[PDB]
Enzyme design. Structure first.
Site, short mmCIF file in Angstrom:
data_model
loop_
_atom_site.label_atom_id
_atom_site.label_comp_id
_atom_site.label_asym_id
_atom_site.label_seq_id
_atom_site.Cartn_x
_atom_site.Cartn_y
_atom_site.Cartn_z
N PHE A 111 0.76 -1.17 -0.14
CA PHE A 111 0.01 -0.02 -0.09
C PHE A 111 0.67 1.36 0.04
O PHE A 111 1.72 1.48 0.81
CB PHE A 111 -1.02 0.05 1.15
N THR A 157 26.14 -30.65 10.01
CA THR A 157 26.18 -30.68 8.52
C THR A 157 27.16 -30.91 7.97
O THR A 157 28.33 -30.60 8.29
CB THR A 157 25.40 -29.00 8.24
N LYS A 159 29.81 -31.12 5.33
CA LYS A 159 30.60 -30.30 4.43
C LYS A 159 31.75 -30.88 3.84
O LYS A 159 32.38 -31.98 4.22
CB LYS A 159 31.08 -28.99 4.91
N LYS A 185 23.51 -34.19 8.92
CA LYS A 185 22.50 -33.14 8.41
C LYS A 185 22.75 -33.07 7.09
O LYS A 185 23.99 -32.67 6.51
CB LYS A 185 22.36 -31.89 9.11
N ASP A 187 22.80 -30.58 4.19
CA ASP A 187 22.67 -29.03 3.73
C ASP A 187 21.38 -28.86 3.37
O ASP A 187 20.83 -29.62 2.47
CB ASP A 187 23.79 -28.45 3.01
N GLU A 188 20.59 -27.46 3.45
CA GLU A 188 19.44 -27.05 2.97
C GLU A 188 19.54 -27.13 1.54
O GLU A 188 18.60 -27.58 0.69
CB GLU A 188 19.01 -25.73 3.31
N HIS A 278 14.53 -26.78 8.35
CA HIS A 278 15.36 -25.57 8.01
C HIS A 278 14.79 -24.34 7.44
O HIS A 278 13.83 -24.64 6.69
CB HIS A 278 16.71 -25.94 7.12
N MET A 281 16.25 -19.21 3.39
CA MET A 281 15.76 -17.81 2.86
C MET A 281 15.01 -16.86 4.09
O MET A 281 14.47 -15.89 3.50
CB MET A 281 14.77 -18.11 1.70
N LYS A 318 26.19 -12.18 20.03
CA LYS A 318 24.92 -11.34 19.72
C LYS A 318 24.82 -10.43 21.04
O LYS A 318 25.36 -10.85 22.38
CB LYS A 318 23.66 -12.03 19.72
N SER A 363 22.89 -23.03 15.70
CA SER A 363 23.77 -23.25 14.56
C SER A 363 24.39 -21.96 14.10
O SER A 363 23.97 -20.73 14.25
CB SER A 363 23.20 -23.87 13.15
N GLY A 365 28.86 -21.35 13.22
CA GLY A 365 30.15 -21.15 13.48
C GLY A 365 30.33 -21.35 14.94
O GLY A 365 31.28 -20.83 15.53
N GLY A 388 31.49 -27.09 10.95
CA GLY A 388 33.00 -26.89 10.84
C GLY A 388 33.66 -27.23 12.30
O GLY A 388 34.75 -27.75 12.45
#
Lengths: 448, 119, 448, 119
Positions: A111, A157, A159, A185, A187-188, A278, A281, A318, A363, A365, A388
């Site tokens: 709008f 995951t 790798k 896991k 990966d997505e 997962h 996006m 964070k 998840s 790092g 990792g």
């Protein structure tokens, strides 16, 4: 009826226990007062129309309108407001997150009078949530099925996500699982691709699951990604996981979409499969403070559409305000009843009337030195993912898994004894390094 | 570089990657249950691990239950009473594994399981 | 292998004809140089990892990395850049828009070093697009099936969207269709709801389609919304439309999701149904210039996943730059080959190698006086939607439909004779008012 | 308020909501084809409208084709030649509808259809 071109602002409206409530962060265009902006949010997500239509006289359209029933300013922002909107229960198709999103966020974000708009929260009334299956199993059932109690679960995951053969991929899984992780896991992005077709991956990952389970004596799983281009392909992949007898499959719920996700959640309920979700996006939608939808809305929607795990980000690195927002939507995902708490971004009291909770998955790092903080902040009902942080261990996947499992159990043991993980965490880890060479090796690669 | 042991290293879920619990350390784990108003309960089995004899359907496993030692210890105020019952279970079944469960009557679910004795 | 914590910036890389290319508008955090930001976009949407992993030595990971191969500044913005990224064909599951989105936009929008990120365009190579069915029918087949040539098509969304009985809803449809519209439309929100269950709506709308078709002698349709909470329900609704023999169904592709949408597009191809696509919730993603995904990316994705119509917004009341962007993605939706044209937001030359085009649907407060501009700007291969512009006519739906059909045909006739719609439009409409009382009545309600 | 006619008002797609085309107006529509290098073609039928006799499957209709008058007028340079053929078709089938089609050989599709004569 006469043809031709603040009705939706009702500040004294009393919300009904059947109403779906929405909290919108609205930024009006210059010259648009906040009451007119709040009215527009309600009109443009309900019955607003640019010219009068005679068919309105065939019904009672006040029964179908959204009402902006409260507006408040935002501290530190001269042109942001929280507008609260109530939607009648009858607007919504039972059991359809797709229709809930369409009805509330389908139109209003375009709008012109709204320079920016963000949906921050939804109050899902019990009358509507009881039309949804919810999680195929949920936290407590999952713990009982997998025989796992008293600690966060651990995953990894694989790798590189693409580049390995299906067999080499499965070999990495086996070595992670045998060292003490509960899960590996997909990966997505890993669905079916040249050089690693999905059915080959499922075969070798199943071999790895069972080899590591027989070796360790603990139940193991691998999140086998069923995300696919069509619903028929998605179910085909879940069906083969079912045949293989494995415990858990995976879906990218936002990129696959809610209609497919709800179908898969139903299939998982019907066949005993756990469903790892997962949130690929999500940051397209949920990152900017001024526009989009906050992740807590996407999280409530997943609990309704159905999943047993959901990725929830991290709290390490964070600031206190970000961690408080994460803890807020972690409670919205796990708990039965969550009281309103604006300091944690909980805009509405939320009652799930016994719909099971979803395990949040941390998840990003993380490594052994994050184990005290993660354990303290999330508690037991979490999955901690070490990609990792496992495959990067200098002695390989099984010692890397063991270092993570030892670090976690050292933290759990100390917490249970009454020690303070927030202050003693580094010393608890250092103490475990004395008898665990695997953890000691991890602790020299990565730093406190 | 050390190789993670591939044989003789079977596990029992939470705390089984730690050194064996001392008596004092076990009492501290039991006291954690009591402080949280969770009910301790012992169970035992000569077979230590899950298997899949009757079905391989998803999330079906055999061997998740062991055999209950007496009853959950409702009203337990003293962690040494759980240690006492541990020694009784060992004496009756010295060739069995024994573990301590915890039950949460507010969540209405089993919430703890850790190994307490290996033969 | 050593454990431990501008490789992805390759400005001399030559793109391959099989590469998927992406144009990202990137806003770096303070202190992050544009080359490092572009490298991060490529790394965090491909093979970037926070610590080294030994498994990389089992493959050749340079074959799987995304490469940022060009960066340019944005005029008028001191801290925005267009970063171009190339992705290898082997990353993508054939035929899966879901995997394409997951792979490219699944992760990178959350990277801390990027304050904001918007995906502006994708170059879909023929090698990848040939793995997709595309539109069930597409522009030319649809015109041949419906026997409609030489003019924009006309539609009307029934209002109020909720509040009418299924029979009263169908009555409104019949009156619109009999006056000269080609289509009526379910609102994106109208799925199945208390007081209007979907199968009842389908029955009465089918009665209206056939009554108006028999009366007028022209083929009629109603976009019957099949959007649903589960894939099984969605197909159930398409199946009943199939049984009723009607020409067109509808899907909300973003809120239902691409996995369900691709399934429905396959069903429509298999059963001869046209598929109308509504873009509900697109502005959550595509409105802000600094973050999200531009609608042209969502439009390309729909053409690949499959649809015969797609809502495309309006050009009236918009500035020249906005209209140029709309015309750019209209060409991307309809044409076989679209040359790069930055003035129209076409960042890559796009070759569709005979995949059919999608009819764009214009909507948004339009009425008879907009007919010259809409006809001039979109041309024949469009649907013009008149919701309030039909149901708001003072004489009812059939005269309102007739006024719109007369206005459109007056514009088409004059254009075909060589007259300039951009300068003579108002006079062409005024001339038609002289012999069409329906148009004259519409022209007094709404203004030039 | 006038009521939209419910009988005797059947239609023929594009331009059939306009007043009947004068000869000059029809020639202008044909010239529009010629300027665009589209090929005019006449077709005729006593039955004016679609029906569904052989199938009701989605997007199947009978009566979409009429009968071709001669051949598409490849190489037409003069709109009056289409009007000439219109008068021949009317003379042979005065009880038939006649309409003018256009064919686009670059898009490879039929692209125009408008009514030219009603009995």
């Amino acid at each position: 009826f006469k043809a031709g071109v603040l009705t939706y602002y009702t500040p004294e409206y009393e919300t009904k226990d059947t109403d779906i409530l929405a909290a919108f962060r609205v930024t009006p265009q210059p010259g648009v007062p906040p009451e007119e902006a709040g009215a527009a949010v309600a009109a443009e997500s309900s019955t607003g129309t640019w010219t009068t239509v005679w068919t309105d006289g065939l019904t009672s359209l006040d029964r179908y309108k959204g009402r902006c029933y409260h507006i408040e300013p935002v501290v530190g922002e001269d042109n942001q407001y929280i507008a609260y909107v109530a939607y009648p229960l009858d607007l919504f198709e039972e059991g359809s997150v797709t229709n809930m999103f369409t009805s509330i966020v389908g139109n209003v974000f375009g709008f012109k009078a709204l320079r920016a708009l963000r949906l921050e929260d939804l109050r899902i009334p019990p009358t509507y949530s009881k039309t949804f299956q919810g999680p195929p199993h949920g936290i407590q059932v999952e713990r009982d099925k997998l025989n796992k109690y008293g600690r966060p679960l651990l995953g990894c995951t694989i790798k590189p996500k693409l580049g390995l053969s299906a067999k080499n991929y499965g070999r990495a899984c086996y070595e992670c699982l045998r060292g003490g992780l509960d899960f590996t896991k997909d990966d997505e992005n890993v669905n079916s691709q040249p050089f690693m077709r999905w059915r080959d991956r499922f075969v070798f990952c199943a071999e790895a699951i069972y080899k590591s389970q027989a070796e360790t004596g603990e139940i193991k799983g691998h999140y086998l990604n069923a995300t696919a281009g069509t619903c028929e392909e998605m179910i085909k992949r879940a069906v083969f996981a079912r045949e293989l007898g494995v415990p858990i499959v995976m879906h990218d719920y936002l990129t696959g979409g809610f209609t497919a996700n709800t179908s898969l959640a139903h299939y998982c309920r019907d066949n005993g499969l756990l469903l790892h979700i997962h949130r690929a996006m999500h940051a397209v939608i949920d990152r900017q403070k001024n526009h989009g939808m906050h992740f807590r809305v996407l999280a409530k929607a997943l609990r309704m559409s159905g999943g047993d795990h959901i990725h929830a980000g991290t709290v390490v690195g964070k600031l206190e305000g970000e961690r408080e927002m994460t803890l807020g939507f972690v409670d919205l995902l796990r708990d039965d009843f969550i009281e309103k708490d604006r300091a944690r971004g909980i805009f509405f009291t939320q009652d799930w009337v016994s719909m099971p909770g979803v395990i949040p998955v941390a998840s990003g790092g993380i490594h052994v030195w994050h184990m005290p903080a993660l354990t303290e902040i999330f508690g037991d009902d979490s999955v901690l993912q070490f990609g990792g942080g496992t495959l990067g261990h200098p002695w390989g996947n099984a010692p890397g898994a063991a270092a993570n499992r030892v670090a976690l159990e050292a933290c759990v043991q100390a917490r249970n004894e009454g020690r303070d993980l927030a202050r003693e965490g580094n010393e608890i880890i250092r103490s475990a390094c004395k008898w665990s060479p695997e953890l000691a090796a991890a602790c020299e690669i990565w730093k406190a | 570089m050390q190789v993670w042991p591939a044989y003789g290293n079977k596990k029992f879920e939470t705390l089984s990657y730690l050194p064996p619990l001392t008596e004092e350390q076990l009492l501290k784990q039991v006291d954690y249950l009591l402080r949280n108003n969770w009910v301790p309960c012992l169970e035992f089995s000569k077979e230590g691990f899950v298997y899949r004899e009757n079905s391989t359907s998803p999330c079906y496993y055999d061997g998740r239950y062991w055999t209950m030692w007496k009853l959950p210890m409702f009203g337990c105020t003293d962690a040494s009473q759980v240690y006492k019952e541990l020694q009784e279970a060992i004496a009756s079944y010295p060739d069995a594994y024994v573990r301590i469960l915890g039950f949460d009557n507010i969540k209405q679910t089993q919430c703890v399981s850790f190994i307490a004795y290996k033969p």
